[PDB]
Amino acid sequence: AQYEDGKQYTTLEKPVAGAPQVLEFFSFFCPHCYQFEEVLHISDNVKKKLPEGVKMTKYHVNFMGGDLGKDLTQAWAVAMALGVEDKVTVPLFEGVQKTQTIRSASDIRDVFINAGIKGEEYDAAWNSFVVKSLVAQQEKAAADVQLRGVPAMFVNGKYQLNPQGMDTSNMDVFVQQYADTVKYLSEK
């Protein structure tokens, strides 16, 4: 076939019922994630080729960067709760990996203040039980699939993208191949 299990994707031994149609995992400590977000715009190019009726989910993970990693996962919950993902994704990535100005919770908070979310609003979100359940969701989705590496994308809880089996000589070709794959997997 043109798309074979074990080549552009792998299939879960342990299918995950009720999973989000398109489920993506990342860490602000994850260097490829930085590329995936900053250079490649994977999520965006996937969305642009996804069909009718299909929602896209992106979660943060704990297994990188110790205590800050966990803080970052609570902060991403805050970002999801407030709908400010698109205003913090870049400053968080750049603050962790480029400038290295994120070293504690307070620094994570500075990024949201600088992006214009209000202190009160952030601190309330940060401490809200809605954010708690949203942290649990992220953890539970990771656990549902045995996740030990990011970046990672899962389609319908059944298929996992395998970018190591796609040509990387051309970044644009890699993205379309990646996105077309998600599209194939989605129609499956």
Q: Examine residue 151 and say whether the peptide bond preceding it is cis (omega within 30 degrees of 0).
A: yes
In this structure, what CATH number is given to the domain that contains residue 83?
3.40.30.10
Question: What does the alpha-carbon distance between residue 149 and residue 30 come to, in Å, rounded to a whole number?
Answer: 9
Please state, as a whole number, how many other Cβ atoms lie within 10 Å of the Cβ of residue 142. 21
The residues, any chain, with a CB within 8 Å of residue 124's CB and separated by 6 or more, are: none
Question: What does the alpha-carbon distance between residue 48 and residue 183 come to, in Å, rounded to a whole number?
Answer: 10
Q: Please give the structure tokens belonging to residue 35.
A: 């590329």
Asked whether 56 and 46 are in contact (CB, 8 A), the reply is yes
Question: What does the alpha-carbon distance between residue 72 and residue 65 come to, in Å, rounded to a whole number?
Answer: 9
**Structural domain of 141:** 1-188
3-class secondary structure for the chain? CCCCECCCEEECCCCCCCCCCEEEEECCCCHHHHHHHHHCCHHHHHHCCCCCCCCEEEEECCCCCHHHHHHHHHHHHHHHHHCCHHHHHHHHHHHHHHCCCCCCHHHHHHHHHHCCCCHHHHHHHHHCHHHHHHHHHHHHHHHHCCCCCCCEEEECCCEEECHHHCCCCCHHHHHHHHHHHHHHHHHC
The residues, any chain, with a CB within 8 Å of residue 40's CB and separated by 6 or more, are: 171, 174, 175
Asked whether 74 and 135 are in contact (CB, 8 A), the reply is yes
| Number of domains the chain is built from | 1
DSSP 37: I
Question: What does the alpha-carbon distance between residue 140 and residue 138 come to, in Å, rounded to a whole number?
Answer: 5
CA dist 89 → 26, 46, 48 (Å): 11, 17, 19
Question: What does the alpha-carbon distance between residue 24 and residue 57 come to, in Å, rounded to a whole number?
Answer: 6
Question: What does the alpha-carbon distance between residue 131 and residue 122 come to, in Å, rounded to a whole number?
Answer: 11
Technique of determination: X-ray
Pairing of strands 159-161, 152-155: antiparallel
Question: What does the alpha-carbon distance between residue 141 and residue 25 come to, in Å, rounded to a whole number?
Answer: 9
Question: What does the alpha-carbon distance between residue 155 and residue 19 come to, in Å, rounded to a whole number?
Answer: 8
Pairing of strands 22-26, 9-11: unpaired
Question: What does the alpha-carbon distance between residue 86 and residue 14 come to, in Å, rounded to a whole number?
Answer: 32
Pairing of strands 22-26, 152-155: antiparallel
Question: What does the alpha-carbon distance between residue 166 and residue 9 come to, in Å, rounded to a whole number?
Answer: 10
Question: What does the alpha-carbon distance between residue 48 and residue 171 come to, in Å, rounded to a whole number?
Answer: 17
Can you tell me which residue has the tokens 């699939």?
145
